[PDB]
Paper text:
Toll-like receptor 4 (TLR4), a superfamily of LRR proteins, is the principal receptor mediating innate immune responses against infections by Gram-negative bacteria. In an attempt to prevent the systemic immune response caused by LPS, a TLR4 decoy receptor was constructed by combining LRR modules from the TLR4 ectodomain and VLR. The constructed decoy receptor was shown to attenuate the TLR4-mediated signaling process by trapping MD2, implicating a potential therapeutics for bacteria-induced sepsis and inflammation.
To analyze the interaction interfaces of other single mutants (M41E and V134L), we obtained the modeled interaction interfaces by superimposing their apo structures into the complex structure of the wild-type decoy receptor/MD2. However, the M41E mutant exhibited an increase of 86.31 kJ/mol in the Coulomb interaction and a decrease of the LJ potential by 4.53 kJ/mol, respectively. Thus, an increase in the binding affinity of the M41E mutant was likely to come mainly from the increased charge interaction.
Author numbering: 28 to 303
Write the structure that this text describes.
């Protein structure tokens, strides 16, 4: 049926027209690629014959629902990819048993909020990619206080329009060493003052949004910052509004990735010098 890539270790089962998890596979399998298969639903213990799973790819499997305890057995799974599944229902315990999950990829899974996302138990989670979804709020649920290992959070291409100070409230009780935050390609046109106060970010992606200006000293408390994207935004370079950001981008050209340009001229924000 599938295609053995690594004996008793890795197999390729995509494009085979499967509706159920294959059984004619070594119970030692570590990596399984079940992508592009009409699984439709995932009941409890859907992966029982795979106690040795570390990587599971379920991308585009027409999955509509994941019941409670779907991966209950997979206790050694570190990477789970669910990209492209039209999830119309996610059980409270859908991710029960995943006590070693480090990477959860849920791009394009009709995710509308992070509140009803049963991941508050995956304390080992390091990377959460929920890009290309319907998330409208950047309000990080309280359960994010237990994900003390998260270093990558990709919320790009969603429906976030603002960034309030309360949004990152949770990130003050952990801590979180090197957290790379992507919020690019969002209908974002507003950021609230000090929204990143007492916050420690290594990378910040805010490019290709709807930003015309940002609060003064918005990036004051941020010495852990190594990279930042702000390019492709309708920056208003009228002074003294663009004063703070022009000075900052110029005095931090190394960090900045790409180039934030003025709207109506194309001039780099870092080049603008506001008169006192
Ligand atoms: C892939 O997994 C298979 C099992 O599904 C491995 O083959 C099996 O290897 C064991 C050895 O650990 C064999 O069991 C017994 O081994 C002793 C050696 O002391 C021997 O005296 C017995 O006669 C018996 O062979 C078992 O028969 C064998 N089964 C198969 C599939 O033929 C295999 O080693 C794994 N692939 C690798 C990493 O080589
Ligand atoms: C935090 O996450 C842990 C994971 O073991 C869970 O038991 C707990 O309910 C969550 N909230 C609390 C009480 O800290
Ligand atoms: C663990 C592997 O699969 C099972 C048995 O065939 C052998 O123990 C083999 O080494």
């Amino acid at each position: 049926p599938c295609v053995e890539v690594v004996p008793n270790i890795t197999y390729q089962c995509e494009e085979l027209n499967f509706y159920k998890i294959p059984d004619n596979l070594p119970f030692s399998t570590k990596n399984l690629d079940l992508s592009f298969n009409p699984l439709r639903h995932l009941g409890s213990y859907s992966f029982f014959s795979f106690p040795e799973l570390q990587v599971l790819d379920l991308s585009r499997c027409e999955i509509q629902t994941i019941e409670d305890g779907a991966y209950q057995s997979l206790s050694h799974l570190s990477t789970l990819i669910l990209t492209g599944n039209p999830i119309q229902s996610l059980a409270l315990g859908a991710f029960s048993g995943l006590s070693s999950l480090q990477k959860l990829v849920a791009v394009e899974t009709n995710l509308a909020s992070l509140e009803n996302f049963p991941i508050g138990h995956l304390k080992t989670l390091k990377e959460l990619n929920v890009a290309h979804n319907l998330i409208q709020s950047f309000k990080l649920p309280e359960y994010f206080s237990n994900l003390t290992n998260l270093e990558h959070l990709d919320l790009s291409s969603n429906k976030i329009q603002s960034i309030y100070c309360t949004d990152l409230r949770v990130l003050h009780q952990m801590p979180l060493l090197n957290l790379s935050l992507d919020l690019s390609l969002n209908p974002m046109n507003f950021i609230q003052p000090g929204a990143f106060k007492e916050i420690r970010l290594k990378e910040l992606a805010l490019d290709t949004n709807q930003l015309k200006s940002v609060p003064d000293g918005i990036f004051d408390r941020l010495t852990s910052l190594q990279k930042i994207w702000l390019h492709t935004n309708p920056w208003d370079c009228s002074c003294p509004r663009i004063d703070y950001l022009s000075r900052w981008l110029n005095k931090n050209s190394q960090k900045e990735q790409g180039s934030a340009k003025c709207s109506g001229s194309g001039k780099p924000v870092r080049s603008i010098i506001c008169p006192t």
